[PDB]
Amino acid sequence: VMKKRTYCTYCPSKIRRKANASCKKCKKVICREHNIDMCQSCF
Ligand SMILES: [Zn+2]
Ligand SMILES: [Zn+2]
Numbered sequence: 001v002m003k004k005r006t007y008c009t010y011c012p013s014k015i016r017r018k019a020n021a022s023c024k025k026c027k028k029v030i031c032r033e034h035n036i037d038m039c040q041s042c043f
Contacts, residue, residue, distance in 0.1 A: 002027070005019070005028075009029055019031055021037050023037065026041065
């Protein structure tokens with residue numbers, strides 16, 4: 001059920017920002033333009 005995980009989970013799907021980073025604790029992929037490696041919803 002983990003689809004569209006090529007695009008930053010913090011970025012809206014209409015924006016389509018490629019996720020170069022991924023938050024390890026939740027495995028949600030993120031753009032460094034939003035969060036550096038770790039998503040704000042963890043720790
Ligand atoms: Zn983003
Ligand atoms: Zn996270």
